[PDB]
Design a protein around this nucleic acid. Structure first.
Ligand SMILES: [Mg+2]
Ligand SMILES: [Mg+2]
Ligand SMILES: [Mg+2]
Ligand SMILES: [Mg+2]
Ligand SMILES: [Mg+2]
Ligand SMILES: [Mg+2]
Ligand SMILES: [Mg+2]
Ligand SMILES: [Mg+2]
Ligand SMILES: [Mg+2]
Ligand SMILES: [Mg+2]
Ligand SMILES: [Mg+2]
Ligand SMILES: [Mg+2]
Ligand SMILES: [Mg+2]
Ligand SMILES: [Mg+2]
Ligand SMILES: [Mg+2]
Ligand SMILES: [Mg+2]
Ligand SMILES: [Mg+2]
Ligand SMILES: [Mg+2]
Ligand SMILES: [Mg+2]
Ligand SMILES: [Mg+2]
Ligand SMILES: [Mg+2]
Ligand SMILES: [Mg+2]
Ligand SMILES: [Mg+2]
Ligand SMILES: [Mg+2]
Ligand SMILES: [Mg+2]
Ligand SMILES: [Mg+2]
Ligand SMILES: [Mg+2]
Ligand SMILES: [Mg+2]
Ligand SMILES: [Mg+2]
Ligand SMILES: [Mg+2]
Ligand SMILES: [Mg+2]
Ligand SMILES: [Mg+2]
Ligand SMILES: [Mg+2]
Ligand SMILES: [Mg+2]
Ligand SMILES: [Mg+2]
Ligand SMILES: [Mg+2]
Ligand SMILES: [Mg+2]
Ligand SMILES: [Mg+2]
Ligand SMILES: [Mg+2]
Ligand SMILES: [Mg+2]
Ligand SMILES: [Mg+2]
Ligand SMILES: [Mg+2]
Ligand SMILES: [Mg+2]
Ligand SMILES: [Mg+2]
Ligand SMILES: [Mg+2]
Ligand SMILES: [Mg+2]
Ligand SMILES: [Mg+2]
Ligand SMILES: [Mg+2]
Ligand SMILES: [Mg+2]
Ligand SMILES: [Mg+2]
Ligand SMILES: [Mg+2]
Ligand SMILES: [Mg+2]
Ligand SMILES: [Mg+2]
Ligand SMILES: [Mg+2]
Ligand SMILES: [Mg+2]
Ligand SMILES: [Mg+2]
Ligand SMILES: [Mg+2]
Ligand SMILES: [Mg+2]
Ligand SMILES: [Mg+2]
Ligand SMILES: [Mg+2]
Ligand SMILES: [Mg+2]
Ligand SMILES: [Mg+2]
Ligand SMILES: [Mg+2]
Ligand SMILES: [Mg+2]
Ligand SMILES: [Mg+2]
Ligand SMILES: [Mg+2]
Ligand SMILES: [Mg+2]
Ligand SMILES: [Mg+2]
Ligand SMILES: [Mg+2]
Ligand SMILES: [Mg+2]
Ligand SMILES: [Mg+2]
Ligand SMILES: [Mg+2]
Ligand SMILES: [Mg+2]
Ligand SMILES: [Mg+2]
Ligand SMILES: [Mg+2]
Ligand SMILES: [Mg+2]
Ligand SMILES: [Mg+2]
Ligand SMILES: [Mg+2]
Ligand SMILES: [Mg+2]
Ligand SMILES: [Mg+2]
Ligand SMILES: [Mg+2]
Ligand SMILES: [Mg+2]
Ligand SMILES: [Mg+2]
Ligand SMILES: [Mg+2]
Ligand SMILES: [Mg+2]
Ligand SMILES: [Mg+2]
Ligand SMILES: [Mg+2]
Ligand SMILES: [Mg+2]
Ligand SMILES: [Mg+2]
Ligand SMILES: [Mg+2]
Ligand SMILES: [Mg+2]
Ligand SMILES: [Mg+2]
Ligand SMILES: [Mg+2]
Ligand SMILES: [Mg+2]
Ligand SMILES: [Mg+2]
Ligand SMILES: [Mg+2]
Ligand SMILES: [Mg+2]
Ligand SMILES: [Zn+2]
Lengths: 70, 126, 206, 50, 50, 119, 87
RNA sequence: AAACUUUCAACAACGGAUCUCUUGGUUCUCGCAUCGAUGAAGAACGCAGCGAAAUGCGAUACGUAAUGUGAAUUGCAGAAUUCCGUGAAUCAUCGAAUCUUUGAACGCACAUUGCGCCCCUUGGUAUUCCAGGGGGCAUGCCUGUUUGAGCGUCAUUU
RNA sequence: CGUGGAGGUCAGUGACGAAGCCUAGACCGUAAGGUCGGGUCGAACGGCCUCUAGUGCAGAUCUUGGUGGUAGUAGCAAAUAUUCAAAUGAGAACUUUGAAGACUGAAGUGGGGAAAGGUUCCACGUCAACAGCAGUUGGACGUGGGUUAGUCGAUCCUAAGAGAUGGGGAAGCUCCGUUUCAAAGGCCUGAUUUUAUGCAGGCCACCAUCGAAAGGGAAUCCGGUUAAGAUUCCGGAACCUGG
RNA sequence: AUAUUGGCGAGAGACCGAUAGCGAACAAGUACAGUGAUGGAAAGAUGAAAAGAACUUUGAAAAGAGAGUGAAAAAGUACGUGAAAUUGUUGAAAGGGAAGGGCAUUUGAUCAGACA
């Protein structure tokens, strides 16, 4: 949550068949947002996690509580 | 006695099929016989008990008591009556589980289909 | 047959301070180390294990079978025996019991029953029934589960629905003269059934 | 294993014989079927003989 | 480790999951018999062999 | 309440593909709520419905194809009858019924007579 | 040194998990599995090892397809759909 | 005389015999003929509102469609619209689908979530670079198709 | 004499208590054994005539399980060493913290990795079992959190090796061979401006592939930041490869 | 017409009755051992129904003591019966380097029958 409050990062658990490309686009397409980069990692339980930085125009935090969570 | 060839009087197989039997089959095993009253009425002896049905425990300790079948607990092979219950030490209450075969039907919840069942066993209805 | 033996146990030989039945090998599992094959080890094979090719059935001399069944028949007269052998005949007309041939044709249990009663059966049918008991053994759960005394055996000549009338009544067995079964003529090798013969039947004997 | 005044028997159970042992437990269950399957032929094969 | 295949990363993860205790509601079902997780695994007691 | 089977099968081709899109949105939204609540069984019946949709989007397009191919030598193996591998290469009635010329000439000539004894 | 010291050096797999049967029986250097026999065409069986077999024969598994073949058979391999009735 | 040792008893311990049970195992018998390149058996990994397993399923994941039944499911929470009804159900039946990663396993590899080729399509200012979406490319052999080879060899040119 | 099971019989006994177990109580038998009382107990069981066998235990270094005397015994003695006090807690020789006494002595008991483990990491909760005293502590238990890369590895390369392929052996699983008595392939554009790619040159004869987280190898750094991640994030500043 | 320790579906038994019967009546080819080929267990029973003990009290707790449930807690998720070895308390007795045994009787404890 601090990534979102501090970093402008949207953390998503993501499909393991998906790459940085497919993640970036299918975020762009699903939330109407512009993305900087997509650092990812495989959680120790078998789920890809996505660190996702939006560009300076979007305040991820505002996005976060407009998608639903907070 | 079993004069057929596709029926078994073997005690093992019997008790398996009882206990393992699926829900759809259980409905039929959980039958109650109609009341002397309801019997001359629909011209019919027994019937697969169902929910919003009315009943008289004509056996057991709960003899005489009567009510609406709250739920049929196929899983537990037992029926529950809304009105016949246990008040625990902590005063909270809990359902007793009556067996269909020890009940008697008093008023039949009726359906298009309940009707058809009754009509099919050679019954009649008022 | 393959049982006792689904192991791999070799002995351990002498000298390891322990007895020398073969022993399960390997490790990590309790079973590991224990006795095999031994007719005295747990999970052994059993000594001289039963076979299918036992002599089950017996060849009896065809002619004795007769002399037997015959003898069996002669005693179902003989008052004393029929009496001695169970069978409340304490007070039936005459031995042998000969009923009408009309019996052979009676077609409803309920009918037959009270016919048989009139002929004197009653006390005997009642003697069964008063006697269904739970098989003492384990046939109690090998579908040999109940048990009860033997009733009258009604021999007929032509079956015109008698057998299906008397089927459901407990103790009463039926038989056409042309057969006649030594297992029913002296059940348990005890001489003197309670036989009730239709006349047409009776007359077929010679 | 020669002893007493018996005959000399020649019983051939030295191969692995316990393996090839045909009990005809089904003597009955073959008659029946044979009967059952003769009847179906009469039936099938029209008013013809067997 | 500390540089393993996904193939192993994976087994390791499945491994992790099964290492939980019997969810205490299963115990309360009808006819339940399972008292405890009889299949549990501890890292310094039994090794899983890749 | 869920969606239904027949109610879909009349819904239009891209009415149908549309509903799927909106179901997947429902799901998305739900999976958010799921983690912010001690329970959400509701989810079970929306993901159940997506199935039904896809199921019917498939059924229709399939016997769309199944028919254009209906009535010609060669149609996709997955529209072909499954039966059994061996069944699927047993001789066809015809190539089995196949008698020789010389043969039928005799079958015809001397066929099995329905005779009978008695008199 | 042939005991508890020489076991010190044990930390090098002879087998990894075999792809065909997932068993940790895949001989790395010898590149075959010691149980199933991958990558051989046939699966490895032996008649002197039956408990071996019994640990793998059809039925030990999911039977993903084979389950239903007796049913499918039971009704003569029914191409088609079912109609409708009453009640 | 205690204590202690020993013996009998009562009660209580330890242990799990015995008695009685049995959805199991064994043996007999009858009937029947159906795995797979239309991807089998087997593997792995995942799938539930709350599951680790057994069972079941396959990113449509304890299931979708269909048909029969005619009201449950049940440990809790639940929808509630589902009750004179295209309709409850962890039901039965099953003819329709979905069916990850693999396996004879088939583009090549594989102690690698490793590495290419082709067609269609979409975005990036692109026949050619990158990315997303679909559909493809193993081997032996048979019938045929088409394109070819050899002074093996026939004819035909002027 | 006695046991499991079968045929017959006693219309046998029994929830008003069958079976079983206890019983320095009673009785019958030379004995094997049989019968009763009482206590415990909960669904079955017995007499007589016959039938049947996986039919009687003290041993077999017998099998499996269970249990003793040994015995509160042997023992818990290697690796210099501990101490005062507070805090917490039902509980403190043993946990937290402050003090003091010491050690390892940079060939470390320091600071990191390779193999191997797999979550042990970190937080919170927490003592039934475990840590051969203890336990308020732990690598334990319950519960959550945590592993971010164009440049760091894999990936690519080839080594010893491994091993398909045309083939050659072998009844056959399969053995031999690796460029091998093999018709073994793909690149640059031009020819297109029907049009998409047929052919117009020429080369090129290399004939798989696997095989190195220490060999070969394109390219990154410093400061900051976390309960737990960093040459992977933040910040600033670069560099390589492709287009 | 023959075969059939496999497969799908059935009916059976003078069979075994949880140390037996298939190794497995149970989440058994499981858990666990081995580098591997392989090896491979133990483990069924509260009651009719959880009515699975509110509440009070001692305790840090586990628990104990009351209460309560039930036909029975002499059924309390250590759960039907609950043998033996072996153990605690209680009662009785004997014991100068074992103990047990045989015949006989004293003494103590205990008991049948029998009379009318
Ligand atoms: Mg901000
Ligand atoms: Mg009916
Ligand atoms: Mg009364
Ligand atoms: Mg009931
Ligand atoms: Mg043998
Ligand atoms: Mg010894
Ligand atoms: Mg055995
Ligand atoms: Mg009896
Ligand atoms: Mg008995
Ligand atoms: Mg011979
Ligand atoms: Mg003939
Ligand atoms: Mg170990
Ligand atoms: Mg539904
Ligand atoms: Mg075809
Ligand atoms: Mg070792
Ligand atoms: Mg090696
Ligand atoms: Mg090899
Ligand atoms: Mg292969
Ligand atoms: Mg004694
Ligand atoms: Mg006691
Ligand atoms: Mg027993
Ligand atoms: Mg019972
Ligand atoms: Mg059986
Ligand atoms: Mg039969
Ligand atoms: Mg197999
Ligand atoms: Mg599973
Ligand atoms: Mg389940
Ligand atoms: Mg549910
Ligand atoms: Mg309908
Ligand atoms: Mg189903
Ligand atoms: Mg799909
Ligand atoms: Mg391959
Ligand atoms: Mg791949
Ligand atoms: Mg593709
Ligand atoms: Mg050709
Ligand atoms: Mg040609
Ligand atoms: Mg005797
Ligand atoms: Mg006996
Ligand atoms: Mg026996
Ligand atoms: Mg007496
Ligand atoms: Mg008593
Ligand atoms: Mg008693
Ligand atoms: Mg009982
Ligand atoms: Mg005898
Ligand atoms: Mg014996
Ligand atoms: Mg002896
Ligand atoms: Mg003994
Ligand atoms: Mg001894
Ligand atoms: Mg002994
Ligand atoms: Mg011992
Ligand atoms: Mg002590
Ligand atoms: Mg000491
Ligand atoms: Mg010492
Ligand atoms: Mg020291
Ligand atoms: Mg200390
Ligand atoms: Mg300190
Ligand atoms: Mg110093
Ligand atoms: Mg030094
Ligand atoms: Mg240290
Ligand atoms: Mg480190
Ligand atoms: Mg480790
Ligand atoms: Mg954890
Ligand atoms: Mg820690
Ligand atoms: Mg403690
Ligand atoms: Mg520890
Ligand atoms: Mg300790
Ligand atoms: Mg302690
Ligand atoms: Mg933990
Ligand atoms: Mg990464
Ligand atoms: Mg580098
Ligand atoms: Mg790469
Ligand atoms: Mg080779
Ligand atoms: Mg390589
Ligand atoms: Mg390298
Ligand atoms: Mg730093
Ligand atoms: Mg972080
Ligand atoms: Mg660190
Ligand atoms: Mg940066
Ligand atoms: Mg910059
Ligand atoms: Mg450039
Ligand atoms: Mg046979
Ligand atoms: Mg058979
Ligand atoms: Mg039969
Ligand atoms: Mg057993
Ligand atoms: Mg026995
Ligand atoms: Mg066993
Ligand atoms: Mg069971
Ligand atoms: Mg175990
Ligand atoms: Mg019980
Ligand atoms: Mg028990
Ligand atoms: Mg129970
Ligand atoms: Mg108490
Ligand atoms: Mg009692
Ligand atoms: Mg009890
Ligand atoms: Mg309790
Ligand atoms: Mg008990
Ligand atoms: Mg004396
Ligand atoms: Zn394998």
């Amino acid at each position: 949550m601090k990534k979102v409050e501090d970093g402008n990062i949207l953390v998503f658990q993501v499909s393991m068949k998906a790459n940085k490309y497919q993640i970036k686009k299918a975020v762009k397409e699903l939330y109407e947002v512009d993305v900087l980069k997509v650092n990812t990692l495989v959680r120790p339980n078998g789920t890809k996690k996505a660190y996702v930085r939006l560009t300076a125009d979007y305040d991820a935090l505002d996005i976060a509580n407009r998608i639903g969570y907070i | 006695a079993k004069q057929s060839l596709d029926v078994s009087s073997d005690r093992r197989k019997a008790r398996k099929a009882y206990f393992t039997a699926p829900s759809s089959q259980r409905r039929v095993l959980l039958s109650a016989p109609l009341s002397k009253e309801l019997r001359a009425q629909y011209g019919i002896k027994a019937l697969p008990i169902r929910r919003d049905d009315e009943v008289l425990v004509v056996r057991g300790s709960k003899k005489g008591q009567e009510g609406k079948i709250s739920s049929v607990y196929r899983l537990k092979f037992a029926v529950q009556v809304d009105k016949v219950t246990k008040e625990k030490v902590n005063g909270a209450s809990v359902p007793i589980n009556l067996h269909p075969s020890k009940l008697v039907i008093t008023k039949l919840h009726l359906d298009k289909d309940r009707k058809a069942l009754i009509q099919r066993k050679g019954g009649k209805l008022e | 047959e393959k049982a006792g033996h689904q192991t791999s146990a070799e002995s351990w030989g002498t000298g390891r301070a322990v007895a020398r039945i073969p022993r399960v090998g390997g490790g990590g599992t309790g079973r590991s180390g224990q006795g095999a094959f031994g007719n005295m080890c747990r999970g052994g094979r059993m000594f001289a294990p039963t076979k299918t090719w036992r002599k089950w059935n017996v060849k009896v001399n065809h002619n004795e079978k007769r002399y037997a069944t015959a003898s069996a028949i002669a005693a179902t007269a003989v008052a004393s025996l029929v009496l001695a052998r169970g069978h409340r005949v304490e007070k039936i007309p005459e031995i042998p019991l000969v009923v009408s041939t009309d019996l052979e044709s009676i077609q409803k249990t309920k009918e037959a029953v009270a016919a048989l009663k009139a002929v004197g059966a009653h006390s005997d049918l009642l003697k069964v029934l008063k006697s269904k008991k739970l098989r003492a053994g384990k046939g109690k759960y090998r579908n040999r589960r109940w048990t009860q005394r033997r009733g009258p055996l009604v021999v007929y000549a032509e079956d015109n629905g008698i057998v299906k009338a008397l089927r459901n009544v407990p103790g009463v067995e039926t038989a056409n003269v042309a057969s006649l079964n030594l297992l029913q003529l002296a059940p348990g090798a005890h001489l003197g059934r309670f036989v009730i013969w239709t006349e047409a039947a009776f007359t077929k004997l010679d | 294993a020669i002893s007493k005044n018996l005959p000399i028997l020649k019983n051939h159970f030295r191969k692995h014989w316990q393996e090839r042992v045909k009990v005809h437990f089904d003597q009955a269950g073959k008659k029946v079927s044979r009967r059952n399957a003769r009847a179906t032929r009469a039936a099938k094969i029209a008013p013809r003989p067997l | 480790a500390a540089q393993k295949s996904f193939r192993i990363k994976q087994k390791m993860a499945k491994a992790k999951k099964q290492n939980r205790p019997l969810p205490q509601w299963i115990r309360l079902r009808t006819n339940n018999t399972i008292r405890y997780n009889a299949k549990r695994r501890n890292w310094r007691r039994t090794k899983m062999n890749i | 309440a869920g969606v239904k089977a027949y109610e879909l099968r009349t819904k239009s081709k891209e009415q149908l593909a549309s509903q799927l899109v909106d179901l997947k949105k429902e799901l998305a939204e739900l999976k958010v709520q799921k983690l912010s609540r001690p329970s959400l069984p509701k989810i079970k019946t929306v993901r159940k419905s997506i199935a039904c949709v896809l199921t019917v989007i498939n059924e229709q397009q399939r016997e769309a194809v199944r028919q254009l191919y209906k009535g010609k030598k060669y149609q996709p193996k997955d529209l072909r009858a499954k039966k059994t591998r061996a069944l699927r290469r047993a001789l066809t009635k015809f190539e089995a019924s196949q008698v020789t010329e010389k043969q039928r000439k005799k079958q015809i000539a001397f066929p099995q007579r329905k005779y009978a004894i008695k008199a | 040194g042939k005991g508890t010291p020489s076991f010190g050096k044990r930390h090098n797999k002879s087998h990894t998990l075999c792809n065909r049967c997932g068993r940790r029986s895949f001989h790395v250097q010898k590149k075959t599995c010691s149980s199933c026999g991958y990558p051989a065409a046939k699966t490895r069986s032996y008649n002197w090892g039956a408990k071996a077999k019994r640990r793998h024969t059809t039925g030990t598994g999911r039977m993903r397809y084979l389950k239903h073949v007796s049913r499918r058979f039971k009704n003569g391999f029914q191409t088609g759909s079912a109609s409708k009735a009453s009640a």
